[PDB]
Write an enzyme that holds these catalytic residues in place. Structure first.
Site, PDB file in Angstrom:
ATOM      1  N   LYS A  60       3.220  -1.482   4.250  1.00 27.87           N
ATOM      2  CA  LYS A  60       3.588  -1.081   5.522  1.00 27.87           C
ATOM      3  C   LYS A  60       4.061   0.546   5.375  1.00 27.87           C
ATOM      4  O   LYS A  60       3.605   1.262   6.146  1.00 27.87           O
ATOM      5  CB  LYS A  60       4.652  -1.749   6.229  1.00 27.87           C
ATOM      6  CG  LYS A  60       4.177  -3.103   7.019  1.00 27.87           C
ATOM      7  CD  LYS A  60       2.874  -3.063   7.939  1.00 27.87           C
ATOM      8  CE  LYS A  60       2.589  -4.369   8.569  1.00 27.87           C
ATOM      9  NZ  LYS A  60       1.421  -4.159   9.563  1.00 27.87           N
ATOM     10  N   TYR A 114       4.267  -6.750   0.472  1.00 24.48           N
ATOM     11  CA  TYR A 114       4.228  -6.708   2.105  1.00 24.48           C
ATOM     12  C   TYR A 114       4.928  -5.227   2.537  1.00 24.48           C
ATOM     13  O   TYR A 114       4.132  -4.457   3.479  1.00 24.48           O
ATOM     14  CB  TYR A 114       4.488  -7.760   2.715  1.00 24.48           C
ATOM     15  CG  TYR A 114       4.791  -7.532   4.155  1.00 24.48           C
ATOM     16  CD1 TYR A 114       3.740  -7.504   5.064  1.00 24.48           C
ATOM     17  CD2 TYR A 114       6.072  -7.353   4.906  1.00 24.48           C
ATOM     18  CE1 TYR A 114       3.838  -7.358   6.282  1.00 24.48           C
ATOM     19  CE2 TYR A 114       6.073  -7.363   6.359  1.00 24.48           C
ATOM     20  CZ  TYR A 114       4.978  -7.314   6.917  1.00 24.48           C
ATOM     21  OH  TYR A 114       5.235  -7.073   8.372  1.00 24.48           O
ATOM     22  N   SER A 164       7.297  -1.746  10.441  1.00 23.85           N
ATOM     23  CA  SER A 164       8.546  -2.790  10.297  1.00 23.85           C
ATOM     24  C   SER A 164       9.716  -2.146   9.781  1.00 23.85           C
ATOM     25  O   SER A 164       9.521  -1.259   9.023  1.00 23.85           O
ATOM     26  CB  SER A 164       8.084  -3.892   9.072  1.00 23.85           C
ATOM     27  OG  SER A 164       9.049  -4.777   8.798  1.00 23.85           O
TER      28      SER A 164
END
Ligand SMILES: NC(=O)c1ccc[n+]([C@@H]2O[C@H](COP(=O)([O-])OP(=O)(O)OC[C@H]3O[C@@H](n4cnc5c(N)ncnc54)[C@H](O)[C@@H]3O)[C@@H](O)[C@H]2O)c1
Ligand SMILES: NC(=O)c1ccc[n+]([C@@H]2O[C@H](COP(=O)([O-])OP(=O)(O)OC[C@H]3O[C@@H](n4cnc5c(N)ncnc54)[C@H](O)[C@@H]3O)[C@@H](O)[C@H]2O)c1
Ligand SMILES: O=c1ccn([C@@H]2O[C@H](COP(=O)(O)OP(=O)(O)O[C@H]3O[C@H](CO)[C@@H](O)[C@H](O)[C@H]3O)[C@@H](O)[C@H]2O)c(=O)[nH]1
Ligand SMILES: O=c1ccn([C@@H]2O[C@H](COP(=O)(O)OP(=O)(O)O[C@H]3O[C@H](CO)[C@@H](O)[C@H](O)[C@H]3O)[C@@H](O)[C@H]2O)c(=O)[nH]1
Ligand code: NA
Ligand code: NA
Ligand code: NA
Ligand code: NA
Lengths: 338, 338
Positions: free
Chosen positions: A153, A149, A124
């Site tokens: 990643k 989150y 992302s």
């Protein structure tokens, strides 16, 4: 090729599976169903025009992963499985690090065990962190994501990079997604969030379908042309296609291949609302609310690298993203059946 | 207090256990013995003057961790367990992320399960990354470690921080260690590396004991007073003491308490060699070799915060570190018995 698609029954994975099958690959889907339903399976096969094998299970189960890998003679793995609710990640960090960080670790550990060395990771733009330089380019050093989150990643990209360094025959693509939206043109497959949708598009769709009152626009005082937040929206079908190409062109090509997957242009909240009002035939109700914690004002991708290297670029437009979403929402107001 | 000491039979943990028992705490040691021997247990109890309970097991075993926590009514956890060979981490990244990142994650997940909310983590100055500003201070933003080992420590500090944010009643100390050396003054407990030691002190000790030919000094062209690398060496006994104090003073004190644990001064490779030659009564043989990959030229800690806040500071000197090491090496040339 023989490909294992983790998270294959979720939003992006389902659409990618359809494109993969259309291209004649042999697909094995692995999903724990925490955020999807078996009801999508038949749609995948129908739209994909080929049967995909389904395995219910968890990426955290290394023994099972290894078995699947070997049993199905997998050549490459596309890893979409994980948790992605930003706000929830702040409230429940451990679950995020477990599903995403340990989850990926168990999976690549299983790959090592089974001698599988081609991987595709769902990354992302969040990995760029608070970057004043926009558009974001793959050559920029990563920053520090503000949520568990986002951090998860970035941690996985780092683990993958180190792994590739230690096992140099591996081919690993780090696909940095921007803002996925849209649905299969059939109107029979799309995003099916449970509960309150966190993303703009589905939220708008639910307002339009008559489930919700008004869209809360988080902030109207940003330093943008209209004061609302700006993002790079990308049609899930373009995203899917990018995955098939990346898989096909990078398999057995040693290295860590990083690519931003976006349209390369920014659109504001109002731009999106307007496109949807147009798509659904009625003005979408909305109001202005305070800025949402952690939101950056504006960013979009620099997608030149993927164009150059993989000859891939988006082809669907913002209006299509809106239209396809409405067609799905409208044809299947209750999403996938229980 | 009732404390679980993971990695309790290893180098730093053994010495910390001795100090803990001396202070009358109830100690439960959890160790998988991948880098230590049961033979140290009796020494801990003897020198600690109290019996510590030992449990052979892995931090990655969440179910077992939870059980231990509850069974022993633990109040606080001191987490030393993990892998720490820098070079090996580059060659075998997965094992590092698994033992350190997933390993810690399983442990704090077990703590949540058992309602334990006081934690002490073995961190490292490596987390500062390539920082030109020295000494290193807790207020500096972290950087990017260059090895999977260094990264794993930074990842854990981040996970712990996020956890504390989500469960604000937790007290978590991030203890950033500099360069631990030395041995218990009895000469009956100390570092017992297997194979070629990676660290300076033990390597020197093995040269001195007659096991090795010459110490290879990695680089003599650094921008330091003598051209050799400069570090902040800290006696393991001072480190141990710091852990007891941190545990005692921070228990039940909500927050993420970060402290650098070092002497606050730098010493070169030659300074260390000279101190050891002095300690052992013969010139230590050495030669100059090329720089070792990833080594920074010079750094040391700014330990003012720990002094101020915990009233803790080092008390042993460089000569003592050298002398204690030689006494142990000399009294137990084969380390701990099999
Ligand atoms: N949708 C976005 O806006 C966005 C943008 C950036 C990155 N991503 C990433 O792309 C991937 C796909 O996202 P999506 O929108 O399709 O989400 P999704 O929730 O629809 O798909 C995730 C799938 O993973 C499965 N899953 C979750 N944890 C699992 C586990 N431990 N074991 C097995 N299966 C598990 C879920 O049941 C679900 O079907 C995720 O990694 C997400 O973080 C998506
Ligand atoms: N010694 C140093 O120079 C240095 C400096 C910075 C940080 N540290 C950290 O301090 C801690 C203690 O280091 P040390 O010098 O005492 O090392 P050590 O190897 O002597 O102690 C580690 C102990 O952990 C145990 N262990 C390892 N993996 C385990 C697992 N998965 N489950 C259970 N037990 C496990 C080992 O058997 C060993 O007894 C480690 O986290 C290390 O990374 C030490
Ligand atoms: O109800 C809503 C939802 C969104 N927004 C705004 O719309 C934009 C897009 O928000 P959203 O759809 O939540 O997406 P992002 O926060 O940009 O995050 C998405 O895209 C990121 C990469 O760009 C990924 O890290 C995430 O997984 C994914 O959720 C932002 O300006 C938001 O403030 C609103 O105003 N109201
Ligand atoms: O055979 C040797 C070993 C070391 N050195 C030099 O001695 C210094 C200290 O090296 P070493 O003992 O390996 O420790 P560090 O590389 O500084 O790392 C230690 O200290 C770090 C924090 O400062 C932690 O991250 C690590 O876990 C721990 O191994 C450096 O200048 C090395 O170049 C030599 O010249 N020859
Ligand atoms: Na919270
Ligand atoms: Na439904
Ligand atoms: Na290697
Ligand atoms: Na021995």
């Amino acid at each position: 090729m023989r490909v294992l698609v983790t998270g294959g029954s979720g939003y992006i994975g389902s659409h990618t599976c359809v494109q993969l099958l259309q291209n004649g690959h042999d697909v094995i889907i692995l999903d724990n169903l925490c955020n999807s339903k078996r009801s999508v399976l038949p749609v995948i096969e129908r739209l994909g025009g080929k049967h995909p094998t389904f395995v219910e299970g968890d990426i955290r189960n290394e023994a099972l992963m290894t078995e699947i890998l070997h049993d199905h003679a997998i050549d490459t793995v596309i890893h979409f499985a994980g948790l992605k609710a930003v706000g929830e990640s702040v409230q429940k960090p451990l679950e995020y690090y477990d599903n995403n960080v340990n989850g990926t670790l168990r999976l690549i550990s299983a790959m090592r065990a089974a001698n599988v060395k081609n991987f595709i990771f769902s990354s992302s733009a969040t990995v760029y962190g608070d970057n004043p330089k926009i558009p974001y380019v793959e050559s920029f050093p990563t920053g520090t994501p503000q949520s568990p989150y986002g951090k998860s990643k970035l941690m996985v990209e780092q683990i993958l990079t180190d792994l590739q360094k230690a096992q140099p025959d591996w081919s690993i693509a780090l696909l940095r997604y921007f803002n996925p939206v849209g649905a299969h043109p059939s109107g029979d497959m799309g995003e099916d969030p449970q509960g309150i949708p966190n993303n703009l598009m589905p939220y708008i769709a639910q307002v339009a379908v008559g489930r919700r009152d008004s869209l809360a626009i988080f902030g109207n005082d940003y330093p943008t042309e209209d004061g609302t937040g700006v993002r790079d929206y990308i049609h899930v079908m373009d995203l899917a296609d990018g995955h098939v190409v990346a898989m096909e062109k990078l398999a057995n090509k040693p290295g860590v291949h990083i690519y931003n997957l976006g349209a390369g242009v920014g659109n504001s909240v109002l731009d999106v609302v307007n496109a949807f009002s147009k798509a659904c035939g009625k003005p979408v109700n909305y109001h202005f609310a305070p800025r949402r914690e952690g939101d950056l004002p504006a960013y979009w991708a620099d997608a030149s690298k993927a164009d150059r290297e993989l000859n891939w670029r988006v082809t669907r437009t913002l209006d299509e993203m809106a239209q396809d979403t409405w067609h799905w929402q409208s044809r299947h107001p209750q999403g996938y059946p229980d």
